[PDB]
Amino acid sequence: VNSFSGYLKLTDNVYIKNADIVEEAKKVKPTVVVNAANVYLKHGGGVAGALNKATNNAMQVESDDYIATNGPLKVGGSCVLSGHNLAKHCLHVVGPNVNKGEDIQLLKSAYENFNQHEVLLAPLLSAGIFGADPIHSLRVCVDTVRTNVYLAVFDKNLYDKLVSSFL
Numbered sequence: 001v002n003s004f005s006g007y008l009k010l011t012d013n014v015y016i017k018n019a020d021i022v023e024e025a026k027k028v029k030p031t032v033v034v035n036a037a038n039v040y041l042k043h044g045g046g047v048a049g050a051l052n053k054a055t056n057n058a059m060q061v062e063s064d065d066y067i068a069t070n071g072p073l074k075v076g077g078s079c080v081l082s083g084h085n086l087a088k089h090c091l092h093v094v095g096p097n098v099n100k101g102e103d104i105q106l107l108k109s110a111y112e113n114f115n116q117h118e119v120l121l122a123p124l125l126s127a128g129i130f131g132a133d134p135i136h137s138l139r140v141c142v143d144t145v146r147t148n149v150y151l152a153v154f155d156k157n158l159y160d161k162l163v164s165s166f167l
């Protein structure tokens with residue numbers, strides 16, 4: 001049993017809810033929250049900006065030190081950093097950004113990072129301002145992630161479309 005509440009079950013291991021990932025993290029304090037990161041860990045706007053704002057910019061400070069030491073992530077890659085006030089850990093995962101021309105086949109590689117963690121609270125990778133089709137992102141998630149993933153969908157309209165169209 002875990003603390004996640006109000007989710008619709010899509011598969012054996014994938015659950016979904018209409019919720020802002022910042023309010024859900026604050027309530028649950030999951031072991032892992034996933035950030036929709038870029039390779040520079042610049043959490044300017046989007047999911048990353050919303051999570052970073054909720055940490056009072058401490059996520060950005062920690063991320064700048066990570067990049068100064070290690071250099072940029074790969075598209076499709078990830079790193080584990082602190083979850084600050086939101087979670088034990090934040091798994092920063094880089095899905096391909098369609099608005100930068102990145103290979104959508106890298107979305108499967110991005111979701112494979114989730115398999116290193118038994119339970120996660122996550123957004124749909126490459127959705128929102130990363131430009132991918134969220135219906136596609138949910139299909140890749142279900143077909144790639146084998147660990148238990150609790151997806152937070154920010155848009156009520158999009159949530160209802162993801163559920164209604166789910167095969």
Ligand SMILES: Cc1cc(C)nc(N)n1
Pocket residue numbers: 020021022045046047050128154
């Ligand atoms: C305030 C907010 C929350 C989420 C999940 N994303 C964005 N872009 N902004």
